[PDB]
């Protein structure tokens, strides 16, 4: 299947799981790839940077020392960026992150109520959001919203250049305006904050450049996406909301809603030394595309794998990864859905859907192109 076809772009789980149900471990001639859609497999593709790996450069591929980042490195240099970041952001109070993130998902859920007419809720909550949330965390100043998603929209889709090469070039010219930004933070920022704290803890500048742009951008785009197709969920399937509405059942919905919605779609490797992989012999260079989202998505490990259901075993899901390249994030994402959960249930707004949900075609990152809805107070 063509993962930028518009039938595939509207729901392509079907086609993961039909890939599945054929081979869990499938080789992609076209795209030169492994494509890893079973739920053993990720999982042990993940965690296993001994013999699967995201530093092309332990195949002999040249990456100048100019363009390395927290995740395109392996250990052991990954570990003195990796504990660099966890140690700015274990140095945020979590009571005032969690204040400022449900101040931000109150405040825009407000400017959407009074609104007797179609509202699109990516551009009007997940992106202002998002973009909010991230530069609160970062301790800078937010920058202009719409110029901001341009910029970043062209790097999620160069993620796609394996599949469309045009797609590549727009990236560079967006990574080098995020560089200014960071560049900039770095060269201004207060010492509150998290790019305050990961100043001080400074590994070379370079790698920490690009890791902090990987924060603000991931960050960025990762809760901006969620928020898109949880909200998607949330405006066909109201009852969701309509929950206890208790702390450790927000808990139970929230792992549902990012094991199922969960934006990343594509998670890749390199085979850095040979390794049975599900049914298949993946060899040394061999790119595997894990799909997570689809992994996610195996009955065997999650019955009624399609279904919310509140009563599963925690803990299971790969939408963060696994491992040592495991989320950074992943603390403050389900923190952040959880505050937006707690406002929309504090707004009582009703959403309904004024239009269909209209998918980016961007295949690693899932994200909604237009979430149409009505408001209702
Ligand atoms: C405040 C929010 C977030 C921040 C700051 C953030 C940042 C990061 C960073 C810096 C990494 C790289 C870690 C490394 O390579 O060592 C990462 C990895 C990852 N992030 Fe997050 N992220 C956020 C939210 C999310 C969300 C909401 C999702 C999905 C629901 C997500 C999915 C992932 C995944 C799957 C990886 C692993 C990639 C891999 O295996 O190399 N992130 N994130
Ligand atoms: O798969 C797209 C992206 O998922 C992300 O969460 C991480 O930022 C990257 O490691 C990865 O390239
Ligand atoms: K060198």
Redesign the pocket.
């Known amino acids: 299947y063509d993962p930028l076809a518009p039938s595939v772009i509207a729901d392509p789980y079907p086609f993961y799981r039909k890939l599945r149900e054929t081979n869990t471990v499938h080789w992609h001639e076209f795209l030169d790839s492994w494509v890893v859609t079973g739920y053993a497999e990720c999982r042990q593709v ?1 965690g296993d940077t001994t013999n699967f790996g ?1 530093d092309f450069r332990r195949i002999d591929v040249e990456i100048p020392d100019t363009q390395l980042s ?2 395109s ?1 392996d250990p052991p240099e ?1 570990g003195a960026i ?1 504990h660099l ?1 966890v140690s700015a952001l274990h140095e945020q109070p979590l009571s005032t992150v969690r204040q400022q993130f449900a101040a931000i998902a109150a405040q825009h859920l407000a400017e959407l109520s009074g609104q007797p007419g179609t509202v699109d809720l990516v551009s009007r909550f997940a992106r202002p959001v998002a973009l909010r ?2 530069t609160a ?1 970062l301790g800078v100043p937010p920058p202009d919203g719409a110029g901001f998603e341009q910029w970043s929209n062209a790097i999620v889709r160069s993620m796609d250049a394996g599949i469309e090469p045009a797609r590549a070039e727009p990236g560079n010219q967006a990574r080098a305006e995020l560089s200014r930004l960071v560049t900039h933070w770095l060269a201004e920022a207060d010492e509150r904050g998290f790019v305050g704290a990961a100043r001080r803890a400074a590994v070379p500048a370079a790698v920490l450049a690009n ?1 902090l742009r ?2 603000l951008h ?2 960025y785009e ?2 901006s996406r ?1 928020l898109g197709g949880v909200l998607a969920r949330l405006v066909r399937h109201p009852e969701l909301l309509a929950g206890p509405a208790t702390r450790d059942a927000d808990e139970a919905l929230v792992d549902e809603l ?1 094991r199922l919605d ?3 779609q594509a ?1 890749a490797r390199v085979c850095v030394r040979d390794q049975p992989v599900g049914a298949q012999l993946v060899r040394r260079g061999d790119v595997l595309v894990l799909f ?1 989202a689809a992994a996610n998505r195996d009955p065997a490990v999650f019955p009624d794998p399609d279904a919310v259901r509140l009563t599963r075993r925690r803990g299971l899901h ?13 603390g ?2 389900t923190l ?1 859905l959880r505050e937006v959960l707690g406002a929309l249930r504090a707004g009582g707004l009703r959403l309904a859907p004024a239009g269909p949900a209209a998918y980016e075609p961007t295949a690693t990152l899932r994200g909604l192109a237009e979430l149409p809805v009505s408001v209702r107070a």
């Open positions: 993940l995201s927290v995740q490195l990954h990796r970041l949330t991230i965390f890791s990987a924060v991931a960050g990762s809760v969620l990012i969960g934006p990343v998670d997570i790969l939408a963060f990864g696994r491992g040592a390249h495991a989320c950074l994030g992943a403050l994402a952040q």
